[PDB]
């Protein structure tokens, strides 16, 4: 979604980077117990942190 | 080291040939002394570790001419 997140701001991709990490915390605790039978969701959020961290450095002086 | 500071002489190596022509390794050291030179333009003394062949060069060229060569060499005094 780096095509789509490019139509955002540094104000948003600090809020957007902060909601994936809330989401990542609730997936890791859910997979700690036997309560996550969708383990394709750990990989999706971790790959989407990287797209937002990339767009923060493209904006900040690149 | 045993290095003359104007000429650049240095210990060199050779043999002690005996009467039966046995060769053992020796060195040849340079005739180094230390000496204060009065420099008239700067109005001070300069100590240099210089050979007796090098004290004879300053007799010929002059102390101002010699010290210019050691600055352009990059050597400190």
């Amino acid at each position: 979604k780096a095509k789509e997140l490019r139509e955002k701001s540094v104000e948003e991709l600090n809020t957007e980077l902060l909601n994936l990490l809330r989401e990542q915390f609730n997936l890791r605790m859910q997979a700690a117990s036997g309560q996550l039978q969708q383990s394709h969701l750990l990989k999706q959020v971790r790959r989407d942190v990287a797209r937002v961290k990339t767009l923060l450095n493209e904006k900040a002086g690149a | 080291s045993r290095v003359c500071q104007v000429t650049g002489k240095r210990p060199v190596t050779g043999n002690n040939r005996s009467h039966a022509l046995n060769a053992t390794k020796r060195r040849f050291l340079p005739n180094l002394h230390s000496h204060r030179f009065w420099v008239e333009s700067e109005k001070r003394f300069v100590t240099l570790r210089v050979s007796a062949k090098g004290m004879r060069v300053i007799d010929k060229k002059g102390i101002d001419t010699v010290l210019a060569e050691l600055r352009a060499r990059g050597e400190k005094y």
Partner: protein, 94 residues
């Protein structure tokens, strides 16, 4: 104030065990699985935010990994860090 991005990395899992269960029903203690470079002031600051529950004191220890054998080949498990977070009175946790 520790940044909100550091508080979301300090906690890893809850530790499940008989000793970990006993302190929850006796000493009001949750036993967590934390990061290895976490510190007692961050273990206190991430339970008091992400779980919304007050903490009295934190007791940490580092657990060392075991040497196992994959048939003929030797290998070792990683070390990890283990916290005993003491809750306050009337403080129940999801």
């Amino acid at each position: 104030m520790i940044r909100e991005e550091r508080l979301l990395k300090v906690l890893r899992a809850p530790h499940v065990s008989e000793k970990a269960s006993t302190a929850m029903e006796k000493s009001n203690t949750i036993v967590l699985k934390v990061a290895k470079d976490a510190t007692k002031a961050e273990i206190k600051a991430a339970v008091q935010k992400l779980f919304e529950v007050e903490v009295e004191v934190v007791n940490t220890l580092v657990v060392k990994g075991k040497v196992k054998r994959h048939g003929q080949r030797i290998g070792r498990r990683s070390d990890w860090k283990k916290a005993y977070v003491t809750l306050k009175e009337g403080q129940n946790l999801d």
